[PDB]
Motif scaffolding. Structure first.
Motif, PDB file in Angstrom:
ATOM      1  N   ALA A 115      19.666   1.327  22.975  1.00  0.00           N
ATOM      2  CA  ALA A 115      19.703   2.534  23.845  1.00  0.00           C
ATOM      3  C   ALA A 115      20.869   3.526  23.683  1.00  0.00           C
ATOM      4  O   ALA A 115      20.724   4.691  24.047  1.00  0.00           O
ATOM      5  CB  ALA A 115      19.571   2.122  25.314  1.00  0.00           C
ATOM      6  N   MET A 116      22.017   3.071  23.179  1.00  0.00           N
ATOM      7  CA  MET A 116      23.203   3.933  23.051  1.00  0.00           C
ATOM      8  C   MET A 116      23.865   3.628  21.728  1.00  0.00           C
ATOM      9  O   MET A 116      24.921   2.977  21.692  1.00  0.00           O
ATOM     10  CB  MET A 116      24.211   3.664  24.199  1.00  0.00           C
ATOM     11  N   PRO A 117      23.264   4.096  20.612  1.00  0.00           N
ATOM     12  CA  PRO A 117      23.822   3.731  19.299  1.00  0.00           C
ATOM     13  C   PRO A 117      25.260   4.216  19.101  1.00  0.00           C
ATOM     14  O   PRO A 117      25.596   5.322  19.513  1.00  0.00           O
ATOM     15  CB  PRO A 117      22.867   4.445  18.314  1.00  0.00           C
ATOM     16  N   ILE A 118      26.113   3.395  18.478  1.00  0.00           N
ATOM     17  CA  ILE A 118      27.476   3.864  18.156  1.00  0.00           C
ATOM     18  C   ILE A 118      27.922   3.242  16.841  1.00  0.00           C
ATOM     19  O   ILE A 118      27.629   2.103  16.545  1.00  0.00           O
ATOM     20  CB  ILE A 118      28.505   3.521  19.305  1.00  0.00           C
ATOM     21  N   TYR A 119      28.665   3.996  16.077  1.00  0.00           N
ATOM     22  CA  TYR A 119      29.083   3.586  14.771  1.00  0.00           C
ATOM     23  C   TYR A 119      30.602   3.536  14.786  1.00  0.00           C
ATOM     24  O   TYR A 119      31.226   4.426  15.338  1.00  0.00           O
ATOM     25  CB  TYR A 119      28.600   4.657  13.768  1.00  0.00           C
ATOM     26  N   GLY A 120      31.199   2.519  14.165  1.00  0.00           N
ATOM     27  CA  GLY A 120      32.648   2.419  14.152  1.00  0.00           C
ATOM     28  C   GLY A 120      33.341   3.158  13.040  1.00  0.00           C
ATOM     29  O   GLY A 120      32.882   3.179  11.924  1.00  0.00           O
ATOM     30  N   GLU A 121      34.483   3.744  13.353  1.00  0.00           N
ATOM     31  CA  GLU A 121      35.198   4.612  12.466  1.00  0.00           C
ATOM     32  C   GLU A 121      36.588   4.041  12.255  1.00  0.00           C
ATOM     33  O   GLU A 121      36.928   2.969  12.775  1.00  0.00           O
ATOM     34  CB  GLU A 121      35.240   6.011  13.080  1.00  0.00           C
TER      35      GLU A 121
ATOM     36  N   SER B 113      23.054  -1.179   9.893  1.00  0.00           N
ATOM     37  CA  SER B 113      23.116   0.269   9.701  1.00  0.00           C
ATOM     38  C   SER B 113      23.235   0.877  11.100  1.00  0.00           C
ATOM     39  O   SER B 113      22.331   1.480  11.648  1.00  0.00           O
ATOM     40  CB  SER B 113      21.892   0.764   8.946  1.00  0.00           C
ATOM     41  N   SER B 114      24.412   0.655  11.652  1.00  0.00           N
ATOM     42  CA  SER B 114      24.826   1.110  12.962  1.00  0.00           C
ATOM     43  C   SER B 114      25.096   2.623  12.936  1.00  0.00           C
ATOM     44  O   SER B 114      25.175   3.257  13.976  1.00  0.00           O
ATOM     45  CB  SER B 114      26.089   0.337  13.334  1.00  0.00           C
ATOM     46  N   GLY B 115      25.256   3.200  11.758  1.00  0.00           N
ATOM     47  CA  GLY B 115      25.528   4.639  11.646  1.00  0.00           C
ATOM     48  C   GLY B 115      24.292   5.525  11.878  1.00  0.00           C
ATOM     49  O   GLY B 115      24.396   6.761  12.006  1.00  0.00           O
TER      50      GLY B 115
ATOM     51  N   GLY C  22      34.866   6.101  17.149  1.00  0.00           N
ATOM     52  CA  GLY C  22      33.425   5.829  17.126  1.00  0.00           C
ATOM     53  C   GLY C  22      32.668   7.138  16.914  1.00  0.00           C
ATOM     54  O   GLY C  22      33.187   8.217  17.186  1.00  0.00           O
ATOM     55  N   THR C  23      31.446   7.039  16.399  1.00  0.00           N
ATOM     56  CA  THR C  23      30.586   8.188  16.233  1.00  0.00           C
ATOM     57  C   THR C  23      29.358   7.931  17.057  1.00  0.00           C
ATOM     58  O   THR C  23      28.760   6.834  16.991  1.00  0.00           O
ATOM     59  CB  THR C  23      30.222   8.414  14.782  1.00  0.00           C
ATOM     60  N   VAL C  24      28.995   8.924  17.865  1.00  0.00           N
ATOM     61  CA  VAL C  24      27.782   8.835  18.689  1.00  0.00           C
ATOM     62  C   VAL C  24      26.846  10.029  18.415  1.00  0.00           C
ATOM     63  O   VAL C  24      27.274  11.041  17.805  1.00  0.00           O
ATOM     64  CB  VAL C  24      28.092   8.670  20.222  1.00  0.00           C
ATOM     65  N   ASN C  25      25.588   9.926  18.822  1.00  0.00           N
ATOM     66  CA  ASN C  25      24.700  11.093  18.644  1.00  0.00           C
ATOM     67  C   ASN C  25      24.981  12.127  19.728  1.00  0.00           C
ATOM     68  O   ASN C  25      25.466  11.765  20.814  1.00  0.00           O
ATOM     69  CB  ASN C  25      23.214  10.686  18.610  1.00  0.00           C
ATOM     70  N   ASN C  26      24.701  13.392  19.440  1.00  0.00           N
ATOM     71  CA  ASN C  26      25.006  14.469  20.399  1.00  0.00           C
ATOM     72  C   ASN C  26      23.868  14.715  21.376  1.00  0.00           C
ATOM     73  O   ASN C  26      23.710  15.805  21.871  1.00  0.00           O
ATOM     74  CB  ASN C  26      25.335  15.757  19.663  1.00  0.00           C
TER      75      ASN C  26
END
Ligand SMILES: [Ca+2]
Length: 970
Positions: free
Chosen positions: A197-203, A185-187, A1-5
């Motif tokens: 509140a906690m966006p995450i993108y699948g990898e 556009s989950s990315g 997963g990709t999350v914001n920093n």
């Protein structure tokens, strides 16, 4: 997963595992930035339970007790685990969709540890998942390749796929491919308004990972789809396949044989023949017959399920049946018999709710019968069953019968999991107790009146309950330090009698609510609260993230310094302790009578324990550490009675409410909120040490010392409250002994005080304060209130307190020997000397402020008692009473100094009493002279007593009523 920093990584970790603030059902979870700014709130529904998702990598999700849901391009995995991981369920048909990237694998056994998730009520309806009214929110979790993205779209890889789980929110989703597929556009991981509140993108590796949505029509969470792809690393969006309802319907249905109905009319039973090598069988009630398929070679997929129905069925096995992955389901009560010693094995049995099945067919070595559904399976085979048991829902009653060798065994092990099920023991021969374990979220073992011995309690967590639910009491004898996470419930005693010289702590961070007694002999016992389990990572992953300035990443499930602990509560009729060390740590409440013999008992013990494996299953790793509750909410609580005997020690450091019955022991108090009820100490020091603050709220009787060093002891009432419900009390010590400047002995109204008071340093003793009795007084309450004689406080003892401040209001002080005080304040108090006449008694103070008060000194015409004031005397309207112990005659003269004070003191600060005390029928005459550096009040004559309509004179000063004393002064 990709999350914001921007968000702390641990959030995503805890979110994915349903841990910490993200436990199932948690509501309105607020989310904050690394810079502490509010980003959003999880307030559209309670936190969902993710436990239908496989626990190790989250590529598959349980949608039926026997079928997972994932994507078909996940072609490699052959098994999955649920909950804590301590299980394995194998794929027997991938069940691939032929046009959709999607599969619904049939498993080898019925899952017991978790409930399956509900799936979308809609399925592949074009545009459905864009209606925010129906679906306000979408959550996901997965364990794909894990990155963090910065502001400028830069990607830092923290780990590969299949290493740990991350979870988060996803925006509303548009449909394509006729509603079969959805995407978003989950990315856009920094866009909270779009993506939650906690966006995450699948990898890569997040393939098959689930998407859940809250469905407000049904008021529940729902699996909508499974993840198929995205636009590469740090890409714009993902696609999912929507759970295909017609397809999963076909997959379930094709595994079922035709439905088997019993009719009594067709006669005797259903006879179950099974041919081994073909893997086929039938179920024949004489005329009618029913197909049945089982395993074939190593192929478990050849089995089909049976669904049994019809009123009070009955089935007999002629051959051992090997059902493969076929399961049984009973929709009606049935009894399943066997005289041949025909076994049965298969995927499992489901007993529908409100259904009971008497099952008299043994298992087979190395297999495990899986039981689920909410009905009851009565296990009644004959002989040793060498099969195992995994239960997950409803009830299992173990009623195994003895063979012709008298041997009996229901099962070789029993595992209790998911929190839903109960296992009932009809007697003590069904199972070896040590072979019972409780998995993920537990369930209950009901000992049903049988008393048993356990050398272990194999219990994963707090849902593990050991219990007794019938009125035949039963005892649980334990005999392994050791940790129990579980609960003990209902009609039990528990014996933990260790052999001598052991120093291993039995630790309980679970709970107890039992009607009988808990006995420890030798060793340690520690009852305590339980820190919240959180997700964690390896030390390398925590460092990498520390390297990038995020310090949120944990390396163990629980720790000594975390703020979040669960409160636990322990209740016993009696806690019997012999030769033990006993401790009640933070976040625990204890409700018992403690009966201690040569044991220590530390209420609010700072020594507490963590399990390094907490949340990973039944194996545990105890570590001892220190954790002190500083906030009232985390502080231990004790309610009840402490009987101490024979060298016992009681240390009160918590919120304590109890009476103490002590012999030949000690009590040390350092808590600043102890309330002692009715207490009796015989050869038992009572130490209040620095910072402590205790109330003796009822009677208190000791033949011993009560030592107050920089602490505060109040009797009957506290000096920051006025009470209108006081009862008269006793308060007796061999001695009250204050030390240090901050010591305080506050004795409230309606206390009858007895014992010498000794003060080292400038402590403060206060007799009297405001407060009224209750209108409702027993007879003994009346008979005692009478002995106060109109005074609020009576004290009998002597005062050794040279630097202390001492203060008495509305008191009657019978002083029994010479007494010293630094600073004394009297207000409507009468002091009577009651030492020797051999020499008379002295009260010496440095500073006396005295108001409407009196002194009654005794004389033999030659000498008297004496008040000495060294530095200052202030106040007004005080009286000297003289008890002439010999009738003075005017043929003879009087010259006795009674009070001496600084020379500057007013003359009339002291005047002769107007009334008589004693047999003499005369009043004193008092003259002021100065002499050897001080003003003196001299008894230098007497006066024939005036009869002022009071009745007879008081025979001694103890007979001076308060009303007598006060009206004399006025
Ligand atoms: Ca199939």
């Amino acid at each position: 997963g990709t999350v914001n920093n921007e968000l702390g990584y641990q959030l995503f970790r805890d979110f994915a595992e349903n841990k910490g603030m993200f436990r199932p059902g948690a509501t309105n979870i607020a989310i904050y930035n690394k810079q502490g700014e509010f980003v959003g709130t999880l307030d559209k529904a309670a936190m969902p339970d993710f436990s239908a998702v496989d626990s190790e990598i989250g590529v598959a999700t349980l949608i039926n007790p026997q079928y997972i849901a994932s994507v078909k391009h996940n072609g490699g995995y052959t098994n999955v685990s649920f909950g804590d991981g301590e299980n394995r369920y194998n794929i027997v048909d991938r069940n691939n969709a032929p046009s959709l990237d999607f599969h619904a694998p049939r498993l080898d056994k019925l899952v017991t540890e978790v409930a399956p998730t509900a799936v979308t009520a809609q399925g592949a309806v074009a545009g459905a998942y864009l209606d925010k009214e129906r679906y306000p929110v979408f959550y996901r979790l997965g364990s794909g390749t894990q990155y963090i993205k910065d502001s400028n779209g830069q990607l830092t890889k923290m780990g590969g796929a299949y290493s740990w789980l991350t979870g988060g929110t996803v925006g509303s989703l548009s449909s394509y491919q006729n509603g079969e597929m959805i995407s978003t556009s989950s990315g856009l991981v920094f866009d909270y308004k779009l993506n939650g509140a906690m966006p995450i993108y699948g990898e890569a590796g997040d393939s098959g990972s689930p998407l859940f949505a809250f469905d407000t029509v049904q008021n529940k969470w729902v699996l909508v789809g499974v993840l198929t792809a995205g636009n590469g690393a740090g890409g714009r969006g993902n696609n999912w396949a929507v759970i295909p309802l017609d397809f999963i319907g076909q997959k379930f249905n094709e595994d079922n044989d035709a439905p088997v109905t019993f009719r009594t009319s067709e006669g005797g039973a259903l006879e179950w023949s099974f041919n081994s090598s073909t893997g086929a069988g039938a179920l024949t009630q004489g005329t009618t017959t029913y197909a049945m398929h089982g395993q074939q070679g190593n192929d478990l997929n050849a089995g089909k399920n049976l669904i049994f129905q019809g009123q009070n069925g009955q089935i007999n096995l002629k051959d051992s049946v090997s059902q493969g992955a076929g399961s049984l389901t009973f929709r009606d009560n049935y009894t399943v018999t066997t005289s041949n010693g025909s076994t049965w094995t298969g995927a499992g049995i489901v007993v529908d709710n409100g259904v009971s099945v008497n099952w008299q067919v043994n298992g087979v070595k190395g297999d495990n019968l899986h039981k689920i559904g909410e009905g009851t399976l009565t296990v009644q085979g004959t002989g040793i069953n060498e099969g195992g048991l995994k239960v997950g829902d409803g009830k299992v009653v173990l009623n195994q019968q003895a063979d012709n060798k008298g041997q009996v065994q229901a099962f070789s092990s029993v595992n209790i999991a998911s929190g839903r099920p109960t296992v009932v023991l009809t007697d003590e021969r069904q199972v070896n107790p040590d072979t019972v374990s409780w998995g993920y979220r537990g369930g209950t073992l009901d000992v049903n009146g049988n008393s048993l011995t356990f050398h272990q309690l194999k219990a994963a967590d707090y849902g593990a309950v050991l219990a007794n639910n019938v009125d035949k009491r039963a005892t649980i004898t334990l005999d392994y330090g050791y940790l129990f996470h579980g609960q003990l419930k209902g009609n039990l005693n528990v014996d933990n009698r260790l052999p001598e010289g052991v120093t291993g702590a039995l630790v309980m961070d679970g709970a107890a609510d039992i009607s009988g007694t808990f006995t420890q002999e030798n060793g340690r016992l520690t009852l305590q609260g339980h820190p919240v389990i959180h997700a964690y990572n390896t030390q390398s992953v925590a460092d990498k993230l520390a390297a990038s300035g995020d310090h949120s990443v944990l390396t163990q499930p629980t720790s000594f310094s975390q703020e979040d602990w669960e409160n636990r509560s322990f209740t016993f009729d009696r806690l019997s302790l012999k030769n033990t060390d006993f401790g009640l740590g933070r976040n625990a409440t204890l409700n018992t009578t403690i009966q201690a013999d040569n044991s220590s008992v530390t209420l609010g013990d700072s020594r507490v324990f963590i399990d390094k494996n907490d949340g990973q299953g039944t194996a545990f790793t105890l570590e001892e550490g220190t954790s002190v509750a500083t906030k009232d909410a985390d502080k231990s609580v004790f309610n009840g009675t402490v009987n101490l005997d024979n060298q016992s020690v009681l240390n009160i450091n918590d919120i304590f409410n109890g009476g103490i019955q002590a012999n030949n022991s000690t009590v040390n108090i350092s808590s600043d909120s102890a309330v002692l009820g009715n207490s009796t100490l015989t050869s038992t020091a009572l130490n209040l040490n620095k910072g402590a603050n205790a109330l003796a709220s009822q009677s208190f009787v000791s033949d011993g010392p009560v030592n107050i060093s920089d602490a505060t002891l109040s009797l009957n009432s506290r000096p920051d409250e006025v009470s209108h419900t006081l009862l008269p009390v006793y308060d007796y010590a061999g001695s009250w002994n204050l030390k240090g400047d901050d010591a305080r002995l506050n004795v409230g109204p309606y206390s009858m005080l007895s014992g010498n008071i000794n003060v080292q340093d400038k402590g403060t003793v206060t007799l009297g304060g405001e407060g009224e009795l209750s209108p409702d007084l027993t007879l003994q309450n009346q008979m005692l209130y009478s002995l106060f004689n109109g005074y609020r406080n009576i004290w009998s003892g002597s005062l050794n307190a040279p630097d202390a401040t001492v203060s008495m209001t509305d008191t009657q002080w019978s002083m029994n020997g010479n007494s010293t005080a630094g600073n004394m304040k009297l207000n409507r108090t009468i002091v009577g000397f009651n030492g020797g006449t051999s020499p008379f008694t002295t009260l010496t103070t440095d500073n006396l402020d005295a108001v409407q008060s009196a002194f009654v000194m005794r004389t033999d015409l030659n000498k008297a008692d004496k008040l000495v004031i060294n530095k200052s005397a202030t106040g007004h309207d005080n009286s000297i009473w003289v008890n002439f112990l010999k009738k003075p005659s005017n043929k003879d003269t009087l010259d006795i100094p009674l009070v001496s004070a600084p020379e500057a003191t007013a003359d009339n600060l002291f005047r002769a009493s107007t009334r008589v005390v004693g047999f003499s029928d005369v009043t004193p005459i008092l003259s002021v002279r100065k002499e050897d550096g001080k003003k003196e009040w001299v008894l230098d004559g007497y006066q024939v007593a005036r009869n002022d309509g009071q009745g007879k004179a008081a025979a001694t000063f103890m007979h001076i009523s308060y009303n007598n004393f006060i009206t004399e002064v006025n």
